[model samples]
Target: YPHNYAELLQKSLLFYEAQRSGRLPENSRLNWRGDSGLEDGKDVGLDLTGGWYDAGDHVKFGLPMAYSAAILSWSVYEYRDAYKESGQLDAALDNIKWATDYFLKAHTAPYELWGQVGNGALDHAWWGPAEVMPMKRPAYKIDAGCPGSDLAGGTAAALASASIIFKPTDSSYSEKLLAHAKQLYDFADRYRGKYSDCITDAQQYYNSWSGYKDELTWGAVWLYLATEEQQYLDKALASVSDWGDPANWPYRWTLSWDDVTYGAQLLLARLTNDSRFVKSVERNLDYWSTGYSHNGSIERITYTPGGLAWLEQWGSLRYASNAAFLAFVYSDWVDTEKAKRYRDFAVRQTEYMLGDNPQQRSFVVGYGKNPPKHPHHRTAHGSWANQMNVPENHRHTLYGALVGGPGRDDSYRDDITDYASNEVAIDYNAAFTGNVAKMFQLFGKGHVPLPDFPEKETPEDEYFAEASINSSGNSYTEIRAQLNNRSGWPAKKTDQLSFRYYVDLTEAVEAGYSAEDIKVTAGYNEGASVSELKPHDASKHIYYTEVSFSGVLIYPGGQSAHKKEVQFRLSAPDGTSFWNPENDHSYQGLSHALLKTRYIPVYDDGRLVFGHEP
Candidate 1:
């Protein structure tokens, strides 16, 4: 069944509480929160305070940040009643203003916007609290000569859309947002290029591979919506062809930092009442529902057997939920009879994410019978660490945050170190929370019953493991892991407890290390037989080794480090299911417990440093 609407709605809003950057106010909703990264732009003589961090990482990536703001504002614009009825209207506005205020500060010049804060390499190098991050966080900007159409356009869209949300109550503030939106839009249109071209750091991160044309159209459409200016509408209409050729960009399957064509099409369809725009929207909806052209429906193209529409393995639910938001919006705009398919598709995807899937687990934290406990989030981790790392779950619930999500087989692990299927990001939850709000508006104030979900056995005992690289040298490295027995049952003395290690030398090879040059060894407790290691995926520079422990009384223990740069996986004996602490399930676990760690390097002089720090 769908989650409790009001509870889900409240939790969704609360997720933002943990993502807040800079000096937090006294009235902040997050009780565990405090001032963090207050000097984001102090090195550059600018006051960049108050905005949400991009994701589990604490960097302020402008493109996705602006996109998240625009999407959230658009949701509020369309469904204000849902927020009002839920008594979250003020909170919602506060969230929008928090982001918009940061945008104003970011747009330091008439034609300039500080597109990013904190070097990506620098921010990612350290694995510690954001409150005590010791790195040089240099700010990057885009001006007249270094034009970033995508970033500027997205920021324009955010401000313009937010202006509409504020206009009803704070007319003056609305005008201010509108003024900035118009100037930013003009800046975007006057000079056109991907922001990554100038801000080279963004290329490795949020590269605008789809180009900036749709962003141009998206900015113009929102400006028109806010201002009712014919010229803005004219510009939006003129850029329709740049939406990509019909055969190439046929359907807007994904709505993210890189793409806004679906949003542009939806706005134009509403504004112009034009058949071409309507047809475009319909075609995309058809692609999302039933197959159109070579594209398959959401079920066929993105759906796994477990019911998750995993468009991308990384942040899978973000893609599905974002598409669900579009489906619901399309349903509202189209004729009622023609909209049923879209509405059903939207509802089904939402329900699947809530807990109607094969696993019967909620992807959103703290909402369903079983929700995520260990999200790959820094603040959530900090909260846990501060509370003495008591339970496997987060010290405070992340409330309404959607996880990165399961694999194609619906297989998911909830380890905090598993960023692939466990990370929580602002952009990930923006549309998802909006989709929940839309459902609340359409269905009205209660839990919606879902299809009978599959019932699975829950194991009593759980096992957890993670690995991280601490230090690396010219000929050696150090890695660590926290292996624990979380089972409620007595520890089993198995002869087959094994530890496997794999290393992807893709980066090392690029850094002039060959397969023979790189070697690995493990340091473990006594009574273990280590196997001969071999190449797992030779082409990818992946290698593996298995160590079997004969009989060791396992208990929760401190982290262990070995001298090596590798990924570690733990396996249990036959007929035994390892419990996953995060999903709160004890089941026949996956083949291995995965570990992710940073790559550290040491020059010939034996000085330790990050491989790529700027």
Candidate 2:
């Protein structure tokens, strides 16, 4: 225990010191205060712009997870009389005591603890304290409302840590530990049998990634360890298969390597006792490792994964974190060499993190020494510059306003510089900084340390590598209006017409529709009073019609409540033709016509004479 007691105590102090004065910049683009370092709902403050604040109170777990892990690590070294010479054990204990008290108080506060209250969110709705009134939108489509038994990460880590330092000789400590363990177990049991993959709204498909998200995986591991439940074991064993399908790939809607890898490690640790789960983890680990570059740069694949538009932004840090965690798992449970391999890669990537990389800045642009503005082959959403869709990079425009462009376009990034002050800091940025701090903490645990770490890099030095990279359709238009007998069209006056007009249908042309190939025509028949008019067929590219009429316009202005038809035809750019029922086959792009007629009494002639209207 003494071997690392000093370092452990120092790390706790480091956390305390930072907590007092350090603050992350505020992201101004959204409504959030963005300053709180805690991973609770307060930090996100709910933004309309789509990001990770979906699972409200459950979001609180991210920071607590890190803190709990740290506390656990510290206790492991502190309780073994590891600091007699350094006198750091007492300080570490004090830190744990403070953290435990704070956690207990916060945990007791009234908030949505399990199932959410409204519209499936821990708070009133997914919008949270942020004032944006909830509206049905694509971002809130998935229902991962609240986390229940997933409390295991925080609870188990706390219990495990408390167990190590908890002096059983101290009468009160035993009761407290037991009580905490029981509460944790009780929480886990409550969620049992109720879990389902389907959304409450029956219309949506079941998403394993939806409800409670992957924290359930971590919670499952902890519960299995705590209660030795066979069911927990079975679920953990089966979870890998549950998440194995391609739809489950990239972990969740937001793809980050950390989510998949850490989640895999959590499951594998339990499954480690079982060979089946271990193989599943190995398979996933092997798949991700292939994406890593020798230089430690990770190609941050899209959430969809294995796509051309791989970005290396803050999201890639997640990958590095996962790699780091995998290394730790390897060291603790598997071959030492495999552990070393993953560890070394993690260290290199971490070093690369602290090293000069242009992509980290707000407005640097380039790709592999080529200017980002002029890259030869552009992937979507890769541009770091201000322009929306410059020439060769025009493909980026396909997704339209859906894709969030580079940092320069990100108001949130720009706002941080001004809003970050002694009083208020950015929420997202603080969470980001906390994650980076986690990297250092994990590195110190003798897991793996990045090489050549630096204090900072000038903005230009990081982005200069990719100095030059330059860059920079179609569809159909058809309109058809129908007049039914209910709308006063003649019953037997069969008349019809079809027409096609093009207003620069460039996109469809590129999409393989030819305007020149289409044929259309129009005509009128002055025959028996028009009775019914019907279009045989109609589509984007083609149309057909048939007309039947008596000697007069069946319904002028097509304004009667009864069915009546007059006359019709067909017209298009390629060709034209008069309306015919005998051979009127389907053709495309359709619309209608006007008629001039006076009607003399046909049936019941004596009662009604001639009728003429414009």
Candidate 3:
């Protein structure tokens, strides 16, 4: 996945360049194209909605988005590919320079002091002396001369790392940035050890503000990762144990809840090979394995998995990305079979969301819906559109032209009805979709057959389309199967398969299939009776019937909208099974589980069969 980190870096640089070149102009004017998409740029001054959401208008600018940008730029700087080595180094360095310039200017200001003075709730809370609810803004400022929280420790670490880059050039700039970052670090170091009175109301979702301890832990992780600073690493390790103890904040919300902790701790574990951090990450994984759903479906919608159960109902792309990343982190720790089970389940969840979810049906790509019955409900937040494609009805309307249509307001929605609009360009959604692609790519490359299974060689064909597999045994498989309509048949082309499969009938000696009431032989290259029928417009149907003489077992498969993969499996007595993944017939027989099998996807044709020649 880090392979695409450079792509994200290039994308970010383009965005920043656009902002710098006045292509995306930002200023006091709310309508300015580059005003960070926080406020509607049409209003001249502060409207009833409050000021802009950028640092120039508020104090919350540096921590989340700004900090994320710095981390990404630094990641690219460290992991530059061979092609981007020489000049890309300069580009990465320039990103760091920009980060340091803005961060130093903002960090030394009085915002932290103001947050301290407000007793943890100055600009953040606005009930005033008369108790009229006034709109509240962040406690930090955008520029060097603003007011807000010194609690921007995460931002501080990001700036501090940016500061360290200057050590190779100008010692004075390095010293200044370090000092500025240290001030915030010192405040956070002290703040983390104490329980704030504001914890009750702070936005504790994934270490926002309620849990100062989490902020410190995640911040320390970022600082240590970026700078390789032993002091920060030690501090982070200590604090992770302290704050992560569960006893400190018994019911506190944190990134560790919804697997956000994986982002920080996975790298930490990789860096230090520390079992404690690995265990911490695992604990969360185990929680999600069971807590998220009866079958790991994340029982509820919405992004953050832990806490705030009912606050939000819409899913975010970040949630999928973070969850997938967590799966990668634990892929080695968990049982390989179980991990694959959950990983495939996670992929299905995302697939179900693509265009299947009702909330996201309006656009090719979508955003969160407003509160169900609220006045602003169903209104597309323009900001979401700026980041993603115009967030229409929680779907992506600006995917690709193939799905998004040629004109901005075209009516391809008519042709693409019932499918998620395929606007594939927006970064946040694209990043996550790309993540899913990479996950499948890796899974296809790494997947292995279960024990006691034999491998089969795919048949060679003279068709124009061809397929191959990698040396991982059957781990990597690809099939290029197609059928075209001829003169006798309607002029229709089917480039994609309804589904492909490689089934081994070692235990099912009497297994058979029926299509259109005709008994079809079940074996390699055995064509189904329905293969002669024309495909349906509204639906397509197929069925399989398996009768096992070994145990007098009977298996029936019927076409359903819910049907997924084309694979089926036969388990030994008292074994468990999984079926209906992208590839049908991928199954395993466990020793003590139910007498069942699993169905997952395969990259190529073939299966492991016992006592069979390849």
Candidate 4:
């Protein structure tokens, strides 16, 4: 079977839409997602409630988020028609705007940018849907004294690259982006320090391991392209000259959020035809494709048996797809011989991710055969317990997301616990989206995206109640029930919960009985209400009583608080032969053992949730 690169491109954009955190717009595609992290910048009285949730947790780590935006902007810039032909151009634009708009806010003043919003540790520990997250999300910023060269540089690259894309359509927005891009570049150049160093909370997650040189150079390269600025080009070249070994030119690493020297090398090489820059990119890509060891410290990229360009144990697909996208970028410019070789590498790497591996597992969630069902994502997983096991399978499909792929041996399990191989992130999907777009352009130009793109599936039975008839005599009947909180579609809790049991009073009505003739009482403090049963469908002689488990907490944390049990009994006038428990809707399936009986329905704040009251 062939890979549907066009559809894959569509899904990646959808994934970005899913990760949106703030007041969602009306046309927002995701039905499952709602407004979240709306108070992101409220700690500092600033509205930082936009952008995306980084990785599986709900922290807006500026480094990776900005890196993803820049890379995605580069992707759209390089492959505009790819997104256009696939019918995702507008969606792609909206996606980029969400991140860039946040960047505008994060860039509060000239040099001050809020680099992070939530504490990594605090965010990681608490688990539930992000929509109702009530915890504090402290904002972290870096200004003139605590300069974040890497942050400013990365943001500059994102805005500069995005400006080029918007110029043709929205020139005013493009000019605004360009202005901010220039100011950011100036701040990056003037204050040369890593962002993570200034904001220590970011160190544990997205620390600047590659330092700030690559970001600085990457930003300058983008600025030069955006404005044809001579100084930006000079700064980019100077950064390379200072950091890169002049003789051998150190380009051992793959292009990534942390290290983008490989990308800068390829771009600058094409622009200036500098042999050092050209040779450096060739060396790095050769390590991934033709094999390395060019008389330097660089070694060949390790590979999986199924032919994956393995980089790190964590999120290997992120690195490989980044390299593949870069190869595609370089392929279009180089001659046929080199172009074919680079393009082949790009094709193989991308196809492997789709399903060419030994396992033949599409690493992208919601894609091909047996695609990852359990990505290590809090929102997608929708675990109310904050534990992975609550919902055996992920409640929501994190569509178009590339998971941290297989190990060196092509070993991968769709396990949520395996964060090393099953997590998805904005950074992970960035270049992969571009790579697919390029593929769709080359191999399947007219391939239309899946119509309706994503038709979301309706949730079934997330929350409900179980019941059984404890005892039933001629005069009365006793029922036992438990209102369970098994909500995992963004796991949540509702304290004002209740349920109702419906009964048919036709037999007793002929014997001169009214609703007041019956009495309802319960033994649970989660509690029960009764006495007079209200008419449901008077013509059908149906009546129902209520039980309010209000002021009691029910969460998916564990079995102890998972549900509230209610024991109740209803009595009529003594010895009425007209009593027919079998005719009652809630009494039809009542047995000795308690089970998920659906006839008796549950309600939260009088709104029906579980079961149907017939």
- lDDT tens string, model 4, 454-548? 66667767667788888898778898888887665545567877888999988788889877788887765455454358889999889998877
Q: Where is the poorest 10-residue window by lDDT in model 3?
A: 484-493
lDDT of each: 0.70, 0.30, 0.33, 0.84
Candidate 3 Cα RMSD after full superposition onto the native fold (Å)? 26.4
For 138-219, candidate 1 gives per-residue lDDT tens digits of: 8899989989999999999999999999999999999999999999999999988899999899999899888899899999
What's every prediction's RMSD, in angstroms?
Answer: 17.9, 23.7, 26.4, 3.2
TM-score of each: 0.71, 0.37, 0.41, 0.89
Window of ten residues with lowest summed lDDT in model 1? 579-588
Model 3 clashes, total count: 44
Q: Which has the higher TM-score value, candidate number 1 or candidate number 2?
A: 1
Predicted candidate 2 versus true structure: per-residue lDDT over 266-329, tens digit per residue: 3455456555545445444444444433256654334222111223333243334334444444
Candidate achieving higher TM-score, 1 or 3: 1
For 222-321, candidate 3 gives per-residue lDDT tens digits of 6665467699888877867755453222221223222234455655666776766665555555444434333544433222222111111122333343
Pairs that clash in candidate 1: 459-586, 461-487, 462-579, 477-564
Candidate 4: segments with Cα more than 4 A from true spot: 126-129, 132-136, 241-245, 293-299, 335-337, 470-476, 485-496, 505-513, 527-532, 537-541, 549-562, 571-580
Which regions of candidate 2 fall more than 4 Å away from where they truly are? Answer: 1-99, 106-147, 151-178, 192-210, 213-217, 224-261, 264-267, 270-275, 292-319, 356-614
